[PDB]
Design an enzyme around this catalytic site. Structure first.
Site, PDB file in Angstrom:
ATOM      1  N   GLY A  48       2.924   6.053  10.118  1.00  0.00           N
ATOM      2  CA  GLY A  48       4.287   5.951   9.613  1.00  0.00           C
ATOM      3  C   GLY A  48       5.024   4.689  10.061  1.00  0.00           C
ATOM      4  CB  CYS A  55       3.090   0.818   7.333  1.00  0.00           C
ATOM      5  SG  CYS A  55       1.421   0.677   7.948  1.00  0.00           S
ATOM      6  CG  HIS A  94      -0.417   0.270   2.512  1.00  0.00           C
ATOM      7  ND1 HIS A  94      -0.356  -0.682   3.499  1.00  0.00           N
ATOM      8  CD2 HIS A  94       0.059   1.411   3.062  1.00  0.00           C
ATOM      9  CE1 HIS A  94       0.145  -0.147   4.610  1.00  0.00           C
ATOM     10  NE2 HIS A  94       0.395   1.132   4.371  1.00  0.00           N
TER      11      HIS A  94
END
Lengths: 306, 305
Positions: free
Chosen positions: B143, B145, B41
């Site tokens: 942030g 991820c 993503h």
């Protein structure tokens, strides 16, 4: 969201750990630039443990009586000196992995990460707090001495603790990196006991603010208190006194949540009176006191879940 | 002595974390050999996150649309492909800090350390367990991820988790490093609910053994039970069933303590039926279920990496 006991990443400290051996005694040392720091009781023998005369034990050693091993490489000791309860071994190689660092002596209630090591190799990392009675509740076995405690705010490692001993209640004692013990303890196996411990009030309040930031309000109430009345009640539960400095330090969390510090104190009073009635706060059924206000700000969102 | 929630030393993983930016989205990547792994993503925008078509989003990207930064150095991307929910960015340099590693997919109840990172920089480490409902109770902000979870054995890092999302109850979901989600989740910006969670029985028993090893013994009793009767109690208190394999796995702790597993099960049965009557175990007023048997053995014996 979420809230965990979070340690600092340990890599910058892992690169400094070495093994020090003197006689049949082996423990860990901290290699920074061209100096290895370790507990001075590495020079004790079995007949030495109750009343060692460290100055007399040390003058009998030469540089080559100390074996320092970094991974698979032997370091050459080219000088030694004792500072308080630590030994400083000068070695012929500066550690190429030395991070930016400083030595700091902390106050009770402060938290830090411990990198537990055996034979110069890391076993694990966890968070600890300096208790009001100057002990820490660690996880340390034979051979862990010389393991260190640290924080890494920004890019700089602040070393604050070096492990020396375990007390009869199963808690732990050690020094700063200048070799001064925290608390009234000595590096002798004479009978020593930790003082009565208390709960770190300002940290419990910080953790209640963390709970509000993460969306839980069930424990608040409509009341307030004065600082004096709060301390009269808190003392009855073996809580440390809350000072105006602590109230000031909680300012930012109070601003973020809209809950005045003395209103949160009234919430804590009621929790001490009632317990949690089968509920939890941030996953705990007890009031947690090993997160500081600075820890909560480091971990939590700067936006409250309203 | 003592017993703490202990993570693995994180240095071997810290050397692998990088920052990946695509458009206005920045997250973390894992740089191993000459490939950077990160959540797919990263290629989404706001108008894409609700119902993304990732195959179609990827075609409009060239290698230079992925900005990969390792500390202060930009890595040059020379290929890109998708594997399930993970983007693989081939870079022109192998990471000289690549540890010995493998990718593993863990089972619910197993624990691992998380290296929480932001903008490619490690910020903290903590221990987590994969819950029976395939979530983890992490601590992650915007942030985070691409932060990863791992175990170490000897010299080999086993990577098991890559972080992708937060669920409405505040727990977390992610993938293995081959991009397969743990649990019934999808990488889309929608509310998805975690199933009802249960307590990991074999881990609670492991922690009771840790408590005995550390001198906390008030909950031991004269009774024993059978697997079948204990499992009726476990079912009634929303505990996972205890299998014979779990009994065998507790074998080393049962040996170190000399306490038979079904004897300890009779202790746990009584704690579930009666509570703790105001007492604590290893400092906790709850039954802790995020230590595996191996975790207890590793900590109580001083195993190093």
């Amino acid at each position: 969201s979420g809230f965990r006991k979070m340690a600092f990443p340990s890599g910058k400290v892992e690169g400094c750990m070495v093994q020090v051996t003197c006689g049949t005694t082996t423990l860990n040392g901290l290699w920074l630039d061209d100096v290895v720091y370790c507990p001075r009781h590495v020079i004790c023998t079995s007949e030495d443990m109750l009343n060692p005369n460290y100055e007399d034990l040390l003058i009998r050693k030469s540089n080559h009586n100390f074996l320092v091993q970094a991974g698979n490489v032997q370091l050459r000791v080219i000088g030694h000196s004792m500072q308080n309860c630590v030994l400083k071994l000068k070695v012929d190689t500066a550690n190429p992995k030395t991070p930016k660092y400083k030595f700091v002596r902390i106050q009770p209630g402060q938290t830090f990460s411990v990198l537990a090591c055996y034979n110069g190799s890391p076993s694990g990392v966890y968070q600890c707090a300096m208790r009001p009675n100057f002990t820490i509740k660690g996880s340390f076995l034979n051979g862990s001495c010389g393991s260190v405690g640290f924080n890494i705010d920004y890019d700089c490692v602040s070393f604050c603790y070096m492990h020396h001993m375990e007390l009869p209640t199963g808690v732990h004692a050690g020094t700063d990196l200048e070799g001064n013990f925290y608390g009234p303890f000595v590096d002798r196996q004479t009978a020593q006991a930790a003082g009565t411990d208390t709960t770190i009030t300002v940290n419990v309040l910080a953790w209640l603010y963390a709970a509000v930031i993460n969306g839980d309000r069930w424990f608040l109430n409509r009341f307030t208190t004065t600082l004096n009345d709060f301390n009269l009640v808190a003392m009855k539960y073996n809580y440390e006194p809350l000072t105006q400095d602590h109230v000031d330090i909680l300012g930012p969390l109070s601003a973020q949540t809209g809950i005045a510090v003395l209103d949160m104190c009234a919430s804590l009073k009621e929790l001490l009176q009632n317990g949690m009635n089968g509920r939890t706060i941030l996953g705990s059924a007890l009031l947690e006191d090993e997160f500081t206000p600075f820890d909560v700000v480091r971990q939590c969102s700067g936006v409250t879940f309203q």
